[PDB]
């Protein structure tokens, strides 16, 4: 795969169809599980451990499906979907490096939610700091993640683990 350093929504929708990193590369979920609109930065080095960095964004609009049901009369972005974005981005990064296989989340260490995303927000930002990539029969990525809303840190996740499997 010809690495680019950023991707548009159309690139991400192509990823969901299996048409961004070739058929053997991992796919992102399609909407409504896709939790990013764009990938704004991707590097092989950098990040807190100098072993890789990804940054992505999601535009916030009161018409997003999850505001209507979580909860009725009390809209908030589900924390689980922010966490999924982070798993999605780890898997995407494994694909970007050239890993082949189906993407699967394997787990996470500590997650802390300390603030919320309301429908009046502009933009959620995801930051992923890679710690290790294991290239074995299972390809696995290990990272820490952060979720910010309009510049304000609101979620953290230690030891996100995603793999690509045959």
């Amino acid at each position: 795969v010809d690495k680019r350093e950023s991707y548009t929504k159309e690139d991400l929708l192509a990823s969901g169809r299996g048409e961004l990193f070739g058929a053997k590369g991992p796919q992102l979920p399609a909407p409504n599980m896709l939790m990013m609109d764009r990938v704004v930065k991707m590097t092989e080095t950098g990040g807190n451990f100098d072993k890789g960095y990804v940054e992505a964004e999601l535009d916030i609009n009161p018409d997003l499906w999850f505001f209507g049901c979580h909860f009725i009369g009390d809209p908030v972005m589900p924390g689980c979907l922010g966490l999924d974005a982070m798993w999605q981005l780890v898997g995407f990064y494994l694909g970007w490096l050239g890993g082949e296989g189906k993407g699967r989340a394997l787990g996470v260490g500590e997650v802390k939610f300390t603030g919320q995303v309301l429908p009046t927000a502009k933009k959620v930002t995801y930051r992923i700091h890679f710690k290790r990539i294991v290239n074995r029969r299972l390809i696995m990525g290990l990272a820490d993640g952060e979720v910010l809303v309009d510049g304000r840190l609101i979620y953290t996740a230690s030891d996100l683990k995603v793999g690509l499997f045959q």
Partner: protein
């Protein structure tokens, strides 16, 4: 040889099998119930416990209990 017993302890925990099952020539995949994930985590558990980094393809060759024991011996002395 704290090594041999400590390694058997780690393998037993990681693969979630009994002390009895961790024989020296037992295969992680065939004999124990290890998948691709248990295997990665296994090796990473050996790295963390004994303080030693070993690239991915030094692993993928550590397939049995004897191999894990044997490998870490040389890297500990």
């Amino acid at each position: 040889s704290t090594i041999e017993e400590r390694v058997k302890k780690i393998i037993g925990e990681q693969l979630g099998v009994k002390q009895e099952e961790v024989t020296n020539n037992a295969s992680f995949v065939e004999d124990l119930g290890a998948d691709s994930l248990d295997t990665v985590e296994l090796v990473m558990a050996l790295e963390e416990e004994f303080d030693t980094e070993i690239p991915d393809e030094e692993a993928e060759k550590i397939t049995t209990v004897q191999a894990a024991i044997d490998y870490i011996n040389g890297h500990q002395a």
